[PDB]
Amino acid sequence: MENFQKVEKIGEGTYGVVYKARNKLTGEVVALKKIRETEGVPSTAIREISLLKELNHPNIVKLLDVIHTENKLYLVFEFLHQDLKKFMDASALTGIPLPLIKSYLFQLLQGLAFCHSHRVLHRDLKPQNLLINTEGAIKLADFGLARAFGVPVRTYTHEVVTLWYRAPEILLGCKYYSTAVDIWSLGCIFAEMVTRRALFPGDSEIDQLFRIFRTLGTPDEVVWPGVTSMPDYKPSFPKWARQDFSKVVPPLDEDGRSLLSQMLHYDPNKRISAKAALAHPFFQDVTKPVPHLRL
Template identity: 70%
Template sequence: MENFSRVEKIGEGTYGVVYKARDKVTGKEIALKKIKLENEPEGVPSTALREISVLRELKHPAVVRLLDVLLADTKLFLVFEFLHMDLKRLMDITKGPLQLDLVKSYLRQLLEGVAYCHAHRVLHRDLKPQNLLVDVEGHIKLADFGLARAFGIPVRAYTHEVVTLWYRAPEILLGAKFYSTAVDVWSLACIYAEMASGRTLFPGDSEIDQLFRVFRALGTPGEDVWPGARLLPDYRAAFPRWPRREARLLLPAADSGSAARPTRREPVREHVAVRAERARVGARRPAAPLPVERAPGAARPAAAAFSAFHRLRRSSRRLLISVELISLSPVNKYLYFF
């Protein structure tokens, strides 16, 4: 870890903290996700293992790049390419709809990225603005694959409590144990509507409220629209019967004059420029480097590394083996265990 200097904390998730850092050798900015393992009896959390295994396999411009995985005693560091902010933060800064041509650009990139994941038999299962990263050049990338899983034959029952509530597909809300790539597409459609309108499409505060918001907007599904919906575990015959409506009525009308305007990427660029200026003028203290913690056995001859491996605690040995297995295992085979 001595090759990186920490700049600032930029986020915190369910199993770790994310820092903006700088590679001392190349000078490039990177994102470091630190995963603490002290309270994990099995070593590394399954969500982290999923993310590592998936991102070792997926290589696409619209998928965030995992650059390295570093082990340092009771900590695991995931090294990612750095992007300036997530889509949620960008929309909060904009305080309204994004420019239509930027929405179109983002949507195309997201569709291409999700199509790539699905072609490689991976469901993301947690698409939301907080898990989409953007930069000043207009790129947007899928991130946070902690809930991702492989799909295919044999068909397996999946966990139905996935995807943040506002972006959760109706089949999951109705308790489906078997679902497909459509759950990611539903999430993308909700995100698209939010980018274009500046407001959350279905901001439910409970599962039943979320479901009724969808039914109220699109109509309560019948066999003619959704064959088999009534057979799902949580479908009730007593559901209110809202009339069917076209989905396009939920989305704002396209601005006919937007095509003549250049794509606006100023919100991200301006935000980054303001932060840089504040850092320069504010005379902040230099960022402290990350603690120097070398993974046992790093950059040593094979015999010494083997000896160092046996001096590790049992939990650390299990973690190291897990990380190495990830690098050797195809993503589909590995993820079937979760």
């Protein structure tokens, strides 16, 4: 748009591309996400997204504006320094120090508990949409998109969506999501920060499902009442026994593993809430370290 000196392309999300951009008049640097079906844009999603502008929390990336013009919809966000995905890549030889991992998890749970208390769900959480700054904060970006817009497959044209963070109830085709889907994704991210490998790097929907099954055991009616009646459930699923859990995130102490196991419960009703998670003993010693960021 005319308004920006549009510095660069930041990345490509499920719902659209992100640019770093400078406002010519004001000089403020912002993150610009262009959404896109493109029939002209739904009114219903416009009000719902516009509503998100009222979210203010230290752990949520601020949505500054929502601009509908032409067939495109632009979300203008405050600009943060780096995404968690790039930071994890850069930390791969050493590892993110545990106190910083714990600090990030704590903050992210706070951001989720805030959103969830406001009845806003993410439903797309992943390292690419977690943003960090030089002072140790971490923030969730891109809430409320899948609820307002409905969930397509790709952004617009031919992108490979990440399945790695999808909750099992989603993979099994449940129509109604709950806040528990975000706890699941956060659990996957937590595990990935600790081990420096994705916990469940599925190639396809079924590979993703079966990777979860091989690790946590194939769910049944005992651990997950109602599971066998879900729309994509097949009695033909192989039956894998659950893995010893100390094999899943070995570096983690027992507090971390117990918290992680509660974030990974099959049954969304037994899965821990962000609010209860914040009270877990894992966070007794939580501090706020400063990351080393190469910008």
